[PDB]
DNA sequence: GGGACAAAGGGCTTTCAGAGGAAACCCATCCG
DNA sequence: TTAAATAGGGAAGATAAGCAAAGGGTTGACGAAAGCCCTTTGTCCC
RNA sequence: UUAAAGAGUCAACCCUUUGCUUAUCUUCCCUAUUUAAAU
């Protein structure tokens, strides 16, 4: 058995619908891209790293690393431009997260 | 530079006019989510979901001339 | 050879936490599946990746904050990030739970 | 109607299927006109008209209730509750393969245009999607109306969009005439005063709403006049075809 | 543990459930050998446990 | 040290409201 | 290693009887706009 | 150019029963002939 990508679709005649392209099983591009950026090894604990995201969290596991303990994307971004520079791990994380797209505001 | 926005009359008018004309070539979208009472007044009362036109074009069937 | 999907119907029991008096009834579900044919024993997954530059270029706003951030950055080592991004593809993390049950995984890049 | 360039069998994944609040599916002709304008401004070559044909298209999901894409926490207002299933704000996606024809006014050479187009396509987007693959572009020359049929037939096989006009409104025409609406332009409502959060402080800003027109899908070999299958910018912020309303 | 073919449902609400034993195992008192083997066997088999 | 304002963050939260509904479409040619 | 020359008309295609019952169709996650309180930082006054 | 951004994931016994069947006429008719040296 092979495991193609699934979809979140409102209730229909099926209970589990798999992604396909003209009758052929395929995988979503978001799923392919998520596994590439799983390099966030630069926090305090939790070996077997996770994907780089602002407020780095794993909703599947229900836990959110890089919480309100003075290690965030926005805190480091504000601190880098306001004088004092960061350590090697902090810049390597900020640049890696900036490579990933997104809109930041609030 | 333009900022597109939606029209309130079109959604309600099209939904009401098309639900009774049997046009089975449309999607269905629901706004708000788990608590749709904080978006608009039409979404709060029309919880069934607004209707959208399905603009899928015909596709070139393969293994033949066209 | 392309792999189709197909649809099947399964029957079983009702095992839901908090509902003990309704566990003696049946359950009928309709699902999709996907598996290799009985004459083939190898799954081939093919795709493409594109890497582009022009980093530190904001798409919305930024006339002094973006320039200050760019000046503060660019001293980091991109070699480690590039090594890790390529390794996540070469080692075989891009392919999910299809990984298990395989005695040999080959990657052609 | 002198120089045309053809790019056929272009694969794009992740196309934003939501063009308006009531239209989900193919991008309107405005998207392709904007792509042509972007090519003209970036490359420095004047482009007159754009034609698009749908080889394949499929909206992700089922017959109804297309799909929902999972969202992520990316704003600076959270951190405590930003650990479980951010809200939705739905945004449909689709996958399609198209074919494009561009009217070009360039006479310096014959092979440089292919290279300059291929350079731009490798880094371009179609309604937010990513281009997977495409064929090598080729150039056709038309001197009169009779040989326009040849450059038209060079686009086989695909389905081209033609304009049929609106009679009363899209809602009544769709049920009766059995056609599909499309966005052809925007109508301005009122001018933006505060220019703080806008992406440009020099370009005047406006609030606009889409204007709807009814279109049809026709085989390339069944098109009477090729001028009815080319779109370009018009007056009063609209997109119009050279041949006007299509008539058999 | 039920047999829909026979219409009877063993391991009913009489203090022998997968969820009851699994909940009690982490909350202090452990289980017996047969209970541990049952929980491990039911974990080898898939399913959803939450609500 | 006391008073006022703003921002950031969390929590005490918590306030707010509410059952419609029915069904598989568009369309046949260039080229070696 | 052959030139031509034609290849049937007519009739006609059956009827009756019946197509089963019973059981079941899962759960969990995807909110905005405030009120109050506390803490910290920064500005100003006393 | 409605530009910019985003992991759907996990689990399943479809089982049991059976009589298709009775009848039958395909008949009549017919000109295939006309040659030439072995390469």
Reduced 3-state DSSP string for C21-41: CCCCCEEEEEEECCCCCCCCC
Residue A70 vs residues A50, A55, A76, D79: alpha-carbon distances, Å: 19, 11, 8, 11
| CB-neighbour burial class of residue E4 (10 A; exposed 0-12, middle 13-18, buried 19+) | middle
What is the C-alpha R_g of chain D?
A: 20
Q: Which residue has the tokens 């309303």?
A: D245
Is-contact B5 D186, C-beta < 8 A? no
Largest Cα–Cα separation, chain C: 68
Question: Do strands D3-16 and D93-104 pair parallel, antiparallel, or not at all (unpaired)?
Answer: antiparallel
What is the C-alpha separation between C64 and D43, in angstroms, rounded?
29
Using a CB-CB cut-off of 8 Å, the residues of chain A touching D69 are 30
The conformation of residue B32, written as its DSSP 8-state character, comes to: S
Check if residue B24 sits with its Cβ under 7 angstroms from strand F: yes
CA dihedral C68, C69, C72, C75 (to 10 degrees): -140
DSSP string, chain D: --EEEEEEEEEEEEEE-BSSSSEEESPPHHHHHHHHHHHHHHH---EEEEEEEEEEEEESS-SSS---PPP---STT-SSSTTS--------EEEEEEEEEEEE---S-SSHHHHHHHHHHTT-EETTEEEEE-PPPEEEE--SSTTHHHHHHTT-S-EEEEE---SS-HHHHHHHH--EEEEEEEEEEEE----SSSS-SSS--EEEEEEEEEEEEEEGGG-S-GGGG-EEE-SSSBEEETT-S---
What is the C-alpha separation between D89 and B32, in angstroms, rounded?
8
Residues 29-48 of A with CB under 8 A from D: 29-30
What is the C-alpha separation between A40 and A52, in angstroms, rounded?
5
Is-contact D140 D226, C-beta < 8 A? no
Pick from C30, C32, C46, C50 the residue to mutate for testing the D interface (most D CBs within 10 Å): C50
Would you report the helix, strand and coil content of chain B in percent, each value rounded to 5? 30, 20, 50
B to D CB pairs, distance under 8 Å:
108
What is the C-alpha separation between C107 and C92, in angstroms, rounded?
8
Using the Cβ of A98 and the Cβ atoms of chain D, whether some distance falls under 8 Å is answered with no
Count other C-beta atoms under 10 Å from residue C31's C-beta.
Answer: 13
What is the C-alpha separation between D21 and D212, in angstroms, rounded?
12
- Length reported for chain A: 106
For residue A86, give its domain range: 39-106
First-to-last alpha carbon distance for chain C, in angstroms, is 21
Q: Which nucleotide is nearest to B20 (CA to C1')?
A: F22
Using the Cβ of D95 and the Cβ atoms of chain A, whether some distance falls under 8 Å is answered with yes
User: Which residues contact residue A17 at a Cβ distance below 8 angstroms, ignoring those fewer than 6 apart?
Assistant: A6, A7, A9, C32, D61, D62
What residues form DSSP beta bridges with B29?
A: B50
First-to-last alpha carbon distance for chain E, in angstroms, is 19
Check if residue B48 sits with its Cβ under 7 angstroms from strand F: yes
Using the Cβ of C49 and the Cβ atoms of chain D, whether some distance falls under 8 Å is answered with no
Shortest distance between the Cα of C21 and any Cα of chain A, in A, equals 24
Using the Cβ of D195 and the Cβ atoms of chain C, whether some distance falls under 8 Å is answered with no
Query: Exposure string (b/e) for B40-50, b if CB count within 10 Å is 16 or more?
Result: eeebeebeebb
Is-contact D161 D215, C-beta < 8 A? yes
3-state secondary structure of B4: strand
Structural method: cryo-EM
Q: What resolution in angstrom units was achieved for this structure?
A: 3.2
What is the C-alpha separation between A21 and D34, in angstroms, rounded?
28
Using the Cβ of C30 and the Cβ atoms of chain D, whether some distance falls under 8 Å is answered with no
- Phi/psi of residue D173, nearest 5 degrees: -65, -35
Using a CB-CB cut-off of 8 Å, the residues of chain D touching A62 are 83-84
Count other C-beta atoms under 10 Å from residue B62's C-beta.
Answer: 9
What is the C-alpha separation between D147 and D140, in angstroms, rounded?
10
Using a CB-CB cut-off of 8 Å, the residues of chain A touching C88 are 35-39
Structure tokens given for D106: 């360039």
Query: Considering CB atoms only, which of C17, C25, C26 is closest to E19?
Result: C17
Residue D88 vs residues A3, B37, B52, D76: alpha-carbon distances, Å: 25, 15, 18, 18
Count other C-beta atoms under 10 Å from residue B59's C-beta.
Answer: 16
**Touch between chain C and chain B: 3 or more Cβ pairs under 8 Å:** no
Structure tokens given for D34: 């904007």
């Amino acid at each position: 058995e092979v495991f193609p990508s699934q979809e979140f679709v409102e209730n229909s005649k099926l209970s589990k619908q798999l992604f396909d392209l003209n009758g052929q099983a395929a995988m979503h591009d978001q799923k392919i891209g998520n596994a590439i950026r799983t390099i966030d090894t630069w926090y305090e604990d939790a070996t077997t790293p996770i994907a780089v995201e602002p407020y780095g969290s794993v909703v599947r596991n229900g836990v959110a690393y890089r919480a309100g303990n003075k290690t965030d994307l926005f805190t480091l971004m504000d601190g880098a431009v306001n004088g004092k520079s960061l350590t090697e791990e902090d810049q390597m994380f900020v640049t890696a997260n900036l490579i990933r797209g997104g809109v930041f505001g609030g | 530079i333009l900022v597109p926005i939606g029209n309130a009359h079109n959604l309600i008018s099209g939904t009401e006019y098309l639900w009774e004309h049997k046009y089975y070539n449309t999607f269905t979208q629901k706004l708000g989510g788990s608590n749709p009472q904080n978006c608009t007044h039409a979404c709060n009362k029309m919880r069934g979901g607004f209707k959208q036109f399905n603009c899928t074009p015909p596709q070139v069937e393969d293994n033949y001339n066209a | 050879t392309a792999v189709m999907v197909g649809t099947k119907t399964v029957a079983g029991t009702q095992s839901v936490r908090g509902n003990p008096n309704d566990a003696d009834k049946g359950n009928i579900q309709t699902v999709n599946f996907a598996n290799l044919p009985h004459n083939k024993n190898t799954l081939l997954v093919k795709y493409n990746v594109k890497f582009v530059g022009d980093v530190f270029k904001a798409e919305l706003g930024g006339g002094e904050y973006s320039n200050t951030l760019q000046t503060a950055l660019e001293n980091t080592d991109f070699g480690t990030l590039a090594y890790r991004y390529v390794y996540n593809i070469a080692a075989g993390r891009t392919l999910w739970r299809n990984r298990v049950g395989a005695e040999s995984i080959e990657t052609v890049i | 109607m002198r120089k045309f360039i053809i790019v056929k069998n272009v694969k794009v994944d992740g196309i934003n299927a939501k063009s308006s609040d009531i239209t989900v599916g193919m991008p309107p002709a405005t998207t392709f006109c904007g792509l042509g304008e972007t090519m003209s401004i970036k490359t420095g070559i004047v482009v007159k008209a754009v034609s698009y044909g749908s080889v394949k298209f499929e909206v992700r999901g089922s017959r109804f209730n297309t799909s929902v894409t999972k969202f992520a926490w990316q704003d600076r207002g959270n951190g405590g509750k930003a650990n479980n299933n951010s809200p939705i704000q739905p945004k449909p996606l689709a996958d399609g393969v198209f074919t494009l024809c561009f009217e070009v006014e360039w006479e310096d050479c014959a092979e440089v245009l292919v290279d300059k187009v291929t350079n731009f396509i490798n880094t371009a987007r179609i309604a937010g999607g990513t281009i997977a693959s495409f064929n090598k572009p080729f150039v056709k020359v038309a001197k009169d109306a009779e040989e326009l049929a040849s450059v038209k037939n060079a686009m086989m096989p695909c389905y081209v969009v033609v304009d049929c006009g609106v009679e009363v409104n899209i809602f009544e025409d769709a049920v009766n005439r059995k056609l599909q609406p499309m966005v052809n332009g925007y109508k301005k409502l009122e001018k933006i005063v505060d220019n703080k959060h806008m992406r440009d402080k020099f370009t005047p800003a406006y609030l606009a709403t889409p204007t709807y027109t009814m279109i049809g899908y026709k085989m390339v070999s069944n098109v009477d006049n090729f001028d009815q299958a080319l779109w370009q910018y018009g007056e009063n912020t609209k997109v119009k075809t050279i041949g006007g309303i299509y008539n058999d």
